[PDB]
Design a protein around this ligand. Structure first.
Ligand code: 5H9
Ligand code: CA
Ligand code: CA
Ligand code: CA
Ligand code: CA
Ligand code: ZN
Length: 316
């Protein structure tokens, strides 16, 4: 909408106070004009018709329980925008500052979040399995990264290309979580998963097997559930990424870590310059090696570490 840029204040899903960029025209809307062509947050009002209504508030204060998922969707979309712009020189998901749209309060008791081809969508959770999913910065960044992938490599959402697609979203979700530097880790969704159980998460990049996901190609799933295991086999690539960054010895194969920033550069380059819609795991290895070669040189530690990490997870 047309209006003037304002700064509201509210509380997120975890009870933390933050400022949010809003727009004033009779109401204060969740429309941040400070980033690209805007970040817009919508109320789906417990229904499934999208996007719903652009979020409108009378007083620019967002401290109601109902406000919390909107506050975080809006704020964490801003953090994710900042990560891509500041770290990778990428302007929004399309590279041309496309407006970023999110809807919260999607459906009832909805234990998931997604990119629907045009916007991000967040359930509130059922209160036991999840609290509202926009409370997780890794979750928000995971979803926006699906848009980045769709505009770049275009990895088809099934089988190995789909598992790469998922891993890319987990990887950048995590790198954005580290960028914000509030309780960062290599787990996915810990801030919104199971409020009654401490210490768990949906997936682990450092040890995917802790939640039954494969950490080696020999353990890959090849059935038809989950689009051919896209959220399962992502563990193999998540583990490789974790090893590239942090190092370790995995099934007897030692990897020299090179740190998160270099992991991000290598995978961002792979995603945007080398991967294609049908890339498989072997092709991802080749793309990562070439990307590291471009950035650091063929004789570099970085190239050597990429090879070690893919060796460790059985991907040649
Ligand atoms: C980071 C977590 C919190 C959320 C994450 N959502 P997503 O974006 O990967 C879901 N994709 C999805 O709907 O594709 C199908 C589609 C394709 C095209 C258009 C529209 C939809 C996830 O990991 N979801 C898991 C479920 C869970 C949460 C582990 C319980 C699962 O869906 O298996
Ligand atoms: Ca208010
Ligand atoms: Ca965390
Ligand atoms: Ca996390
Ligand atoms: Ca929990
Ligand atoms: Zn996903």
């Amino acid at each position: 909408i047309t209006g003037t840029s304002t700064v509201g204040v509210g509380r997120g899903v975890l009870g933390d106070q933050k400022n949010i960029n809003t727009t004033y025209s009779t109401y204060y809307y969740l429309q941040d004009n400070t980033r690209g062509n805007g970040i817009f947050t919508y109320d789906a009002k417990y229904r499934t018709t999208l996007p719903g209504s652009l979020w409108a508030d009378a007083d620019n204060q967002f401290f109601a329980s109902y406000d919390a998922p909107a506050v975080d969707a809006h704020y964490y979309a801003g953090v994710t925008y900042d990560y891509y712009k500041n770290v990778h020189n990428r302007l929004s998901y399309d590279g041309n500052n496309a407006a970023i749209r999110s809807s919260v309060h999607y459906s009832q008791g909805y234990n998931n979040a997604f990119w629907n081809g045009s916007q991000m969508v967040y359930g509130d959770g059922d209160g036991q399995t999840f609290i509202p999913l926009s409370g997780g910065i890794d979750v928000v960044a995971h979803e926006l990264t699906h848009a980045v992938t769709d505009y770049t490599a275009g990895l088809i959402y099934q089988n190995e290309s789909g598992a790469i697609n998922e891993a890319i979203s987990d990887i950048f979700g995590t790198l954005v979580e580290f960028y914000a530097n509030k309780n960062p880790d290599w787990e996915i969704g810990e801030d919104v998963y199971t409020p009654g159980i401490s210490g768990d998460s949906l997936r682990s990049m450092s040890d995917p097997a802790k939640y039954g996901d494969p950490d080696h190609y020999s353990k890959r799933y090849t059935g038809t559930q989950d689009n051919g295991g896209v959220h399962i086999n992502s563990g193999i690539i998540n583990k490789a990424a974790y090893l590239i960054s942090q190092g370790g010895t995995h099934y007897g194969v030692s990897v020299v870590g090179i740190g998160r920033d270099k992991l991000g550069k290598i995978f961002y380059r792979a995603l945007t310059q080398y991967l294609t819609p049908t890339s498989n795991f072997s092709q991802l290895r080749a793309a990562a090696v070439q990307s590291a070669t471009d950035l650091y040189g063929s004789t570099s530690q970085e190239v050597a570490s990429v090879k070690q990490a893919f060796d460790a997870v059985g991907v040649k």
